[PDB]
Amino acid sequence: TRDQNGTWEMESNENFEGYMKALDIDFCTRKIAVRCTQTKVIDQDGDNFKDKTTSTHRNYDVDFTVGVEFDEYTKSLDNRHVKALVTWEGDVLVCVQKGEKENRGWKKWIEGDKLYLELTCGDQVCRQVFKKK
């Protein structure tokens, strides 16, 4: 059928590597690009097409208990092992990530409708904000 309208979720991606290498995309980018699963949204009106494609990768699982030390392998970032410990400070969840990097950790808290996550490493602070679906 000529009807391609709809939302489509990638289930297989054979030889993405060879196609990308043929397109002269550098290996470091190809290694990342094969990990993510594409979603395609097609809006079709006769012979007129709109195609919006995004791609998603899975970062990590992290399971923990407040007050219990745990090894965190940061596979979605720098691929290091840290000994993490999460504690409450009021309503703020505070994590110290013990390891090679000095002053590494994060803070996580709710402010009404929004989740705030502050990541630190050395003198660098990254501030993230999330909203509910």
Place this chain on the structure above:
Amino acid sequence: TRDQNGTWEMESNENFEGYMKALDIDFCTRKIAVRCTQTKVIDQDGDNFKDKTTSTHRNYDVDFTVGVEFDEYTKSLDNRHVKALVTWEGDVLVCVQKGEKENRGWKKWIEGDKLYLELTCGDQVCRQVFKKK
């Protein structure tokens, strides 16, 4: 509140570049990570936490009419300029991407609840399959 349960969508990410650089993440990775939007699913039972995080980025937004050649800038892959012409062959969309690369194009068709996208560059063929959601 200490209740962080929920599906949290990133709306802001300040200085993720500087944080990643402090972690010695190399530029090839930082340049894609900086334009991802995270989805954080938190399941929390008292002091026990599970956090599943994914990240999504844009790939392409194409708008075309069958039979009308259009200019395409392949930002999601090699960022080249091609002149794309899409025609029907039966119920298969067939595209030639005229440009610097030889024998570049793609075919796109439906079978059942699946969408097939065959991408070709030179002697390399990538076969993607998508399931209708």
